[PDB]
């Protein structure tokens, strides 16, 4: 009731302010909508090895929200250095014990998440290849994810 009646405003403010590219709709008994799983969609920033795909997620709140933050994962799982074999997200501002704030809206969710693309943070990695390739061979690194911003290009 607390997160729906939060949640119920996030998808209104997201219908009217809401960056090119970008997606955030909630999932579907039928027709009847569950305002606690989200299908997303993250484009990879312009002038980035992440241009041009289209990297879809799963945005999963829980009756805690917004005390506690939701949790996203990449659908299918993604290479790079924060984001678990599981598709998880790992992100500060994703962390109830550190960064997480109720005021943070699914916009400012998903564009960190777009930052984190493109800016790991070797800090906490989750993804143990993805890790070494990126400390090591850049050139490498960037290679796959070129290849996989393909992959992941629309139609």
Same mark, same amino acid.
């Not at 879809?56 to 929200?65: A, G, I, S």
């Not at 678990?84 to 960064?99: A, H, M, N, R």
């Not at 564009?111 to 993805?130: F, R, S």
């Given at each position: ?40 969609? *993250?484009?990879?920033? $312009? ?14 709140? $829980? ?7 939701? %949790?996203? %994962? ?23 014990? %550190?960064?997480?704030?109720?005021? *943070?809206? *699914? %916009? ?41 911003? $393909? ?5």
């Amino acid at each position: 009731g607390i997160a729906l009646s939060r949640l119920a405003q996030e998808r209104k403010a997201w219908r009217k302010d809401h960056p090119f590219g970008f997606v955030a709709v909630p999932t579907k008994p039928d027709g009847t909508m569950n305002l606690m799983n989200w299908e997303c969609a *993250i484009p990879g920033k $312009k002038g980035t090895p992440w241009e041009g795909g289209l990297f879809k997620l799963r945005m999963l709140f $829980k009756d805690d929200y917004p005390s506690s933050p939701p %949790k996203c %994962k990449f659908e299918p799982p993604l290479f790079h250095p924060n984001v678990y074999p599981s598709g998880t997200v790992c992100l500060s501002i994703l962390e109830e014990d %550190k960064d997480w704030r109720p005021a *943070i809206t *699914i %916009k400012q969710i998903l564009l960190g998440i777009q930052e984190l693309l493109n800016e790991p943070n070797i800090q906490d990695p989750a993804q143990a290849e993805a890790y070494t390739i990126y400390c090591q061979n850049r050139v490498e690194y960037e290679k796959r994810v070129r290849a996989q911003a $393909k992959k992941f290009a629309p139609s």
